Design a protein around this ligand. Sequence first.
Ligand SMILES: Nc1ncnc2c1ncn2[C@@H]1O[C@H](CSCC[C@H](N)C(=O)O)[C@@H](O)[C@H]1O
Ligand SMILES: C[n+]1cccc(C(N)=O)c1
Length: 261
Amino acid sequence: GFTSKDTYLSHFNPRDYLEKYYSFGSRHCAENEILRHLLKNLFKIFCLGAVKGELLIDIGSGPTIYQLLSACESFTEIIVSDYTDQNLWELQKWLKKEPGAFDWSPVVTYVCDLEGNRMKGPEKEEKLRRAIKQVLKCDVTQSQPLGGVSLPPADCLLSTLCLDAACPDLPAYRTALRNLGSLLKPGGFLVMVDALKSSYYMIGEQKFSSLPLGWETVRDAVEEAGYTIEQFEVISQNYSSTTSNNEGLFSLVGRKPGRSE
Ligand SMILES: Nc1ncnc2c1ncn2[C@@H]1O[C@H](CSCC[C@H](N)C(=O)O)[C@@H](O)[C@H]1O
Ligand SMILES: C[n+]1cccc(C(N)=O)c1
């Protein structure tokens, strides 16, 4: 049935994932086009609006940092987290500037271009490394997703391409949303990106399930979780044939309501 979290542990190859989706090279052209659009939207979200603060927690980061490049302009501290241990190790290779770490330069350069070339690649990378304070295990399915570690409430919760993969059905998706809210202060921002109407994605021969949700369904689930949707955009691009069956992606910004009861 739907991919279990133990299948992630035993099947998810971080370096392979990065090469296939985030190399930003001459192949995987559909994946490149989506990446371009994601970077554009994340730039708008984090640089052009009021999504700023002290602490941002990224949920289901996997081995990627593309989703944090504009964010580090607006947040002093970033916590990254994922369920899959090997993803966390891959991330650490890059954070620690190790030989054989994934080459993020073409992505970094693109983001720097988007932001008006106020800094160069090396400076942007240093800024993000400094911003990333913790690399933690997380499980979105749990009432306490970070295992109940003592952390201040976040000003922003970010999650990219995670919830659809981690939730077998809409009731589970609703639960994951509730679980995430436990980490966010009232007035805080929820920034989410995910595939639309996708029931699977591939990493080579390895297949991983996805919950196919249309944009209206995502809207309704987020609103019913209490969030005022401040921004919502659809990315009309599709992943490569046989790589996924998605029809576009979305990005959104929600604000958690003030405390009442
Ligand atoms: N129950 C769960 N809790 C937290 N993360 C989970 C999870 N189940 C799967 N994941 C993670 O969801 C990720 C999907 S791949 C997404 C990676 C990255 N955020 C990007 O934008 O490309 C994987 O890293 C996987 O480890
Ligand atoms: C590229 N990618 C990564 C994670 C999830 C998906 C999807 N839910 O279809 C796609």
